[PDB]
Amino acid sequence: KVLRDNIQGITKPAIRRLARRGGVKRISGLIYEETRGVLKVFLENVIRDAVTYTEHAKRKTVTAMDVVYALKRQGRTLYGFGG
Amino acid sequence: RGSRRQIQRLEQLLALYVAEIRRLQEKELDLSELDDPDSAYLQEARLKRKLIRLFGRLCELKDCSSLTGRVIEQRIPYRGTRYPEVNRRIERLINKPGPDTFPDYGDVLRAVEKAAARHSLGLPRQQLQLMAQDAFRDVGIRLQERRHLDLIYNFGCHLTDDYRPGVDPALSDPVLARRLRENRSLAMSRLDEVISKYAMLQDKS
Amino acid sequence: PHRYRPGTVALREIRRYQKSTELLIRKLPFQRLVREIAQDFKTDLRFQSAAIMALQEAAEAFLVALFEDTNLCTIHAKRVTIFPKDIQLARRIRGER
Structure with missing residues (x-):
């Protein structure tokens, strides 16, 4: 009845360490898939904004500056950066 | 030398x-x-x-320490209880070096209990619990702040060092601003959606 | 105490390099995740390497803060295991938007 999911990519112990870095010592089975999912969604959000800036500048390369402008629009994570 | x-x-x-x-x-x-x-x-x-x-x-x-001036090297004082021993143990708990220092309620409560039993302060269980809860809240605020500052004070590289928010291209192009606003509505929904999706899977299990 | 200040490199640079060594997600899977996402947008997208770094530093901070919030809302004499509903609830209590 219990099953082990496959993945390519982000390993269980990295996720355990991220949780631990937040003070969380014990996480359930769904927390792994959730953490990968949340990570992917956050990255999609940032990259969607970043590429909007890139296309506005008429470039094909997403620059670190594009990513900064995007990140500032994602709420508290980078709040206050640069001033 | x-x-x-x-x-x-x-x-x-x-x-x-x-x-x-x-x-x-x-x-x-x-x-x-x-x-x-x-x-x-x-x-x-x-x-x-x-x-x-x-x-x-x-x-x-050069016979120096390995410190680099990180914000997380800055000590967070705690003097929030009326028992300096408890305050000591908590302050020690939250100033362990490195990027992984962040206790859970259990760690704080354990620190309070241990300080109480070591120094025979004779504090009853519920007083200890309330003390730990107040302490945990206070230190949680301070730890999050210190991490936030460490992040924003040490972010990026030479390519982003001249960033300032007043230069954001969106401020002078309303078409761009409109698109980013659309993006933001979508982003918030997508995040809510994933959080809620795994909550729902949990409530199906 | 005693602090080393190199004559050839500013400490702020050193600090950022050190921080980069502190990341927890292995960089190869991270860059591959960014690729997986980018593939959906445009086949011809390039990324400055420094942009990938900004993404990773920010993303790890974002995940960790989700866990910090959950932690701070979790008050029990006996340690429990964190489930999705705990993340969700904490996010509603002290999290974003």
Whole structure:
């Protein structure tokens, strides 16, 4: 009845360490898939904004500056950066 | 006091590593490169590790500590209870060095209990619990703040060092601003959606 | 105490390099995740390496803060295991938007 999911990519112990870095010592089975999912969604959000800036500048390369402008629009994570 | 010549040699090497790190930071990676174990991103990471090792060796040679002025090196005081021993144990708990220092309620409560039993303060269980809860709340605020500042004070590289929010292209192009506003509505929904999706899967199990 | 200040490199640079060594997600899977996402947008997108770094530093901070919030809302004499509903609830209590 219990099953082990496959993945390519982000390993269980990295996720355990991220949780631990937040003070969380014990996480359930769904927390792994959730953490990968949340990570992917956050990255999609940032990259969607970043590429909007890139296309506005008429470039094909997403620059670190594009990513900064995007990140500032994602709420508290980078709040206050640069001033 | 270390050898002046060797210090100068190692500092030259350090500057070389920095120049190469900057070069790699500016490389533009296509999709196949992002799939490559030897991409500029990975080379850069290896080189940073090499550089930090060399920096540590230079600290050794100059008889210095390994500190770099990180915000997380700043001590967070706690004097929130009426028992200086409890305050001591909590303050020690939250100032353990490194990037992983963040206790849970259990850690704080354990610190309060241990300080109480060690110094025979004779505090009853519910007083200890309330003390731990108030302490946990206070230190949680301070830890999150210290991490936030460490992040924003140490973010990016030379390519983002001239960033300032008043230069945001969106401020002078309403078409761009409109698109970003649309993006933001979508982003918030997507995040809610994933959080809620796994909550729902949990409530199906 | 005693602090080393290199003559050839500013400490702020050193600090950022050190921080980069502190990341927890292996960089190869990270860059591959960015690739997986980018593939959906445009086949011809390139990324500055420094942009990938900014993404990773920010993303790890974002995940960790989700866990910090959950932690701070979790008050029990006996340690429990964190489930999705705990993340969700904490996010509603002290999290974003």
